[PDB]
Amino acid sequence: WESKFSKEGLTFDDVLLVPAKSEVLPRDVDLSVELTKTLKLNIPVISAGMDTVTESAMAIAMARQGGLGIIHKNMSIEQQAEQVDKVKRSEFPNSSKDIHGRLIVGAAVGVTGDTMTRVKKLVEANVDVIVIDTAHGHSQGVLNTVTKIRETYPELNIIAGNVATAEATRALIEAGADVVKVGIGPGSICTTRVVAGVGVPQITAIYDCATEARKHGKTIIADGGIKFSGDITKALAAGGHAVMLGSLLAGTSESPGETEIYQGRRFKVYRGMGSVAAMEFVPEGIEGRTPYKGPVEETVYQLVGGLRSGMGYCGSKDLRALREEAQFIRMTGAGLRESHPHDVQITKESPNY
Amino acid sequence: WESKFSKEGLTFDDVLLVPAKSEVLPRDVDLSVELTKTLKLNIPVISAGMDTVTESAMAIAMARQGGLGIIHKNMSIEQQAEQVDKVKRSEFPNSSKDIHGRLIVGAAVGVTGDTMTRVKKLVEANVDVIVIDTAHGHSQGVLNTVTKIRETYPELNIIAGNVATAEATRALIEAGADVVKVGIGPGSICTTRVVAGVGVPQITAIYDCATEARKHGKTIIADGGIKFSGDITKALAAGGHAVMLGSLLAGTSESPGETEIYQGRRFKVYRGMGSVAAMEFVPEGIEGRTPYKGPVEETVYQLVGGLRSGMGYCGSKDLRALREEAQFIRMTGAGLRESHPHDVQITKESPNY
Amino acid sequence: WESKFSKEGLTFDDVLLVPAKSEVLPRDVDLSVELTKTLKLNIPVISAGMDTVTESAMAIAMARQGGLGIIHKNMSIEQQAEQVDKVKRSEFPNSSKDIHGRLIVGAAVGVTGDTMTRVKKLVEANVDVIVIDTAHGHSQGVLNTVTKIRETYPELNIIAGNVATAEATRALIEAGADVVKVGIGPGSICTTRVVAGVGVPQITAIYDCATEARKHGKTIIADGGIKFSGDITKALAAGGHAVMLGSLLAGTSESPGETEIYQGRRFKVYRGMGSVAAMEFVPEGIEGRTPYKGPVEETVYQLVGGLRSGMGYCGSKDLRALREEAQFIRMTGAGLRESHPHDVQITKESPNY
Amino acid sequence: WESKFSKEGLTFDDVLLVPAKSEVLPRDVDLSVELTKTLKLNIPVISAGMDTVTESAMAIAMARQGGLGIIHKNMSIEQQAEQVDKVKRSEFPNSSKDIHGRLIVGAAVGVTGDTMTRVKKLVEANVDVIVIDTAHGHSQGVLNTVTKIRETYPELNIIAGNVATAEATRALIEAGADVVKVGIGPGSICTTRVVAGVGVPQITAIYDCATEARKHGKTIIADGGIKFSGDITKALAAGGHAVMLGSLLAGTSESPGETEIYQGRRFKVYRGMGSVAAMEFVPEGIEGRTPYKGPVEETVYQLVGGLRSGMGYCGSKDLRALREEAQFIRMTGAGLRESHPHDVQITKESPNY
């Protein structure tokens, strides 16, 4: 009862990274990360397991750039296994590949009667990682599913989430998860925080969960709330090993969403998997759209470029240095307004702003 | 003189609930609450004693859903007794009923020369609870009226308010109140905070008053400031036993307000009982309108659904667990902006957002 | 060097007054205040010494209501003496009058070669109080003028300002001031804070200066930043004995400003005495207008009504109880947004909001 | 890992300067500053080394007013040497001049293969100061260039930057810099903070770097984020010896930018040297424009006037008193809203607001 209000949470717009001594240019920093010893990325960027972000074209484009795509689960078992199989069979100097030289891929599952059959067919399609993808990962049903998957497939890479506390992170890892996916409500189209009243500001969520994961030698995926390339530097410096992106990739050519025309501008639909449209209720997502942006490679190049620039300012030669050594400073809303362009009429913006 | 500035107050938008381990699904949590041992709700939701929110149709619809309606006092004694009598005589598996199987109902009274005659006629109409409904419950006139009612009717359920401090809560309970109604200025159409300069941010008000009420074994109604279903989770986790709603129910079919057409959209009027229109001055309310929303059952279903979702995230199997165990985290305005949808063009919203 | 950033300042919108036990109704509270033993108000409200707020009509209307008008100094010595003489000769149960039954009045002077001649003619016109009215009261020139006036006129009431610190308050009182006028930059049309970079948030300014003034048995006028009736409750609870108003009275019939028509609405001009227009530079005011509001009595009645309501909520039977006993609570921007009307379409406002 | 979030940063809009006892009128304060013993300004204002702010006309106008212009480096070595030579040969009672009675001037260089040849030609053109002008001054490449310049030219004035920490300030001074230029991301058209995630709110940056520079007997230039004359008082009171301005001077006659017409108003272009347009990428600037403002002397006169007014309020007889003695108070967003004009319709603004 007395402790009810002591905790304080920060998100991306509350903080800046403090520059430090640099000896490594942005172009020479190392962006590789091992989520597990058999799940290695050359850039710390994952496309979300959402029906408006990732099917095989997005998963192929992401692995060719050294990242990872998660095939969404809003499709039949047989359809999802075929999508994984198309990525595995695809035929890019930064490409992330398995021991057989095939592009890496992941696939989402839920906690339903079907889960173990879905996992079996995805493993037979040589998926590199399963994502146990739920609204509330800190739940007995989720812990039971992690355990049953880990028992059936002792070497299978498992990402489980979503969570936002040290205690939940601990519980998923004790059940057998390799990677904990962090974020409760920060998503661009998510309304969890408003309709349920629940969540943790994302920089605090990442930091608290990464602090726990490090005790177990496991890794974090920072899922949600990222709006700019600098938010990637921030998410990783807070402890994340890799980021997961939805809205920043939903407008790209390889995303599966419907196109919409409005005021002569092309958009693609972007919607929550908690929206009335995706689950088909008391919804925890809404439906929106984001401008058409062209090939995902051009968006990734700008996002990775901002990350490399941030690492050069922090003097981080690699992502371990960024996670372990980078320092934040807290800012007010006046700090935030100074950090964006201000007091000038803007005519032309940039790919990255 | 020195203590003048130390206290700090929080409201709904300052805080989020921290998720915890869940073993009970949203659909299986228990939403029942005893405001007194003879005043039991199956959902913790009360319609306000306002002439734009509650007469008998609203009171009937609320009790059929397991909640409670307070008949407003802007009508004759004989009119208010007839309204109570229509609810009692009304003829819904979650319905909240008295020992004779009749829907529960409440009725508001003020502190005037008439009060004891109004109370007598409402008791003869078998009202389940009286609400002593005043702007400043921490006043000698209010304490004297609580005492005279409690002396005349030793078993009558009494709600008294409004207050926002432990000391006021203590005083109303010492006079004989069963339930303390909390809120000074958070109402959608209230201007108390601006025209008088007075109030307490509502989450702090609820917490401080619930901390005192628990010492006396009494209950709190969180009255005002609720805009979304998640604010209900927050109000109850702060210590409230039940919420009281005005603006969220004023647009519903069963509300008594006038309809208004504007830009081809139907609204209903919503006004303070401190507005120049309702009292008929130096007013402490203004007049407004809110969109027509259809049957109150559909609004209650979405509000209760968000509460159940929040309880599943908090791992609360019932409202006692939510009040006693749920933890908050404080957020900045940047936290709040992350918690709402952001950085996407919204086309379609949801019943609950 | 190390102390440069420790101090924190609050203004009106940072705080609310905490309700307390009331035994005295708003209508029965006492609003009288002695600024000095020979300068007594029946309501704690002073019209500003500005060429868009106070000449004799405003000074007469204010004293008839129990307040005070300060005749501005943007006119000849002989003109200002005649204005004082018209108020003194004017011929209202709350009227504030001198020992000869004549309405009280004040008049502004600056620190120039002319000051002592201006003061002589105002005293010969039986002015009740001189206001030494400067941008920076904590200046050697101002202290020398206070001393020369106090030496020449041992019984003359002297208001001196403006200041915002305990040290400045101490210095003006040591020179011979009876009343210290507090406010550096909070004025509606003031730009001191932006063009000079200087100021103190007004609730902190009032509190710090009142804390010092009490040590000397002297009084404070809270000058500037008041937008609503509740800000008057706040200013006095922070330590002010009386408030000084500019923009809230500039639209009233008795103000001297020019009228302007815009979008079929009548306005009156309101401008700083630090604006290029009033001084005739590097200006510290701009020029604006405020809607025509009718007779000053109707505005004062609403402002005083909000003050009385706040005092009833605080349980303050008189202004000494409000200054000495009332407690504040700090709120965020979310607190402020809850305190105003919110989440309803407003059709009709009130005289006081 | 544990220290990641403790630091807090402030910028201009977070703070106000506390008025103090004044004996020196604004018109009589001393505005001179020695950046080095051979680099003396009569006003503490420097025009930025940007291709939309400073070539020879701006450098001449700034030195005639007692300030300094930095010739930008987006031009050939031979072009930049000619610009310096035009200022040196130019033929104003506050003019800042070298020992030979010639207007002072500076010139920017980068860290490239060409740098030492550029510096040689600028020194042969009798430049008064070199600015080693980089995005991240806390970098080995920058430290090596400072050392090579200082070794080749033992008496040459060197400004080096940009930085935002004590450690970076220390490193540049140990390499041989005389003056450290402070600012990482506060620029009107800068996007460093958003695309890289990095920076320090500018008042904190100035204070931390000035605290270190004082230990070495060196000076700070506060570069970026200044929007109003009062922000100059603030920057210098935080520890800066002089300010550097870009957007506030880009609209003036002497700036080199292109003119643009929009809605019958004349503008000049203002763009980052990190924008795609200026470097010719992953850009850290965007492109904008600012209204045409007339001769730079009229803008400087208003900026210097606001500084003098702030110094009179602080009781600072000279800039050393302002840097060493002036105190700040922290304000909320409500403080900031009170500090600007508010609650009045503005018709006419002022040159300085």
Swiss-Prot record, chains A, B, C, D:
SUPFAM superfamilies: CBS-domain pair, Inosine monophosphate dehydrogenase (IMPDH)
InterPro entries: Aldolase_TIM, CBS_dom, CBS_dom_sf, IMP_DH, IMP_DH/GMP_Rdtase_CS, IMP_DH_GMPRt
Regulation: Mycophenolic acid (MPA) is a non-competitive inhibitor that prevents formation of the closed enzyme conformation by binding to the same site as the amobile flap. In contrast, mizoribine monophosphate (MZP) is a competitive inhibitor that induces the closed conformation. MPA is a potent inhibitor of mammalian IMPDHs but a poor inhibitor of the bacterial enzymes. MZP is a more potent inhibitor of bacterial IMPDH.
Active-site residues, as the UniProt record annotates them: 190
One record GO biological process: GTP biosynthetic process
Reactions performed catalytically: IMP + NAD(+) + H2O = XMP + NADH + H(+)
Listed Pfam families: CBS (PF00571), IMPDH (PF00478)
Induction trigger: By superoxide.
Enzyme Commission number: 1.1.1.205
Sequence positions that bind IMP: 188, 223-225, 246-247, 270-274, 284
Pathway: Purine metabolism; XMP biosynthesis via de novo pathway; XMP from IMP: step 1/1
Protein keywords: CBS domain, GMP biosynthesis, Metal-binding, NAD, Oxidoreductase, Potassium, Purine biosynthesis, Repeat
Chain residues that bind K(+): 185, 187, 190, 338-340
CDD domains: CBS_pair_IMPDH, IMPDH
Binding positions (NAD(+)): 133, 183-185
NAD in keyword set: yes
Cell wall biogenesis/degradation keyword on record: no
GO terms assigned for molecular function: IMP dehydrogenase activity; metal ion binding; nucleotide binding
Cofactor(s) needed for function: K(+)
HAMAP family according to UniProt: IMPDH
Family: Belongs to the IMPDH/GMPR family.
Record's subunit section: Homotetramer.
Job of this protein: Catalyzes the conversion of inosine 5'-phosphate (IMP) to xanthosine 5'-phosphate (XMP), the first committed and rate-limiting step in the de novo synthesis of guanine nucleotides, and therefore plays an important role in the regulation of cell growth.
Protein name: Inosine-5'-monophosphate dehydrogenase
Organism: Bacillus subtilis (strain 168)
Native organism taxonomy: Bacteria, Bacillati, Bacillota, Bacilli, Bacillales
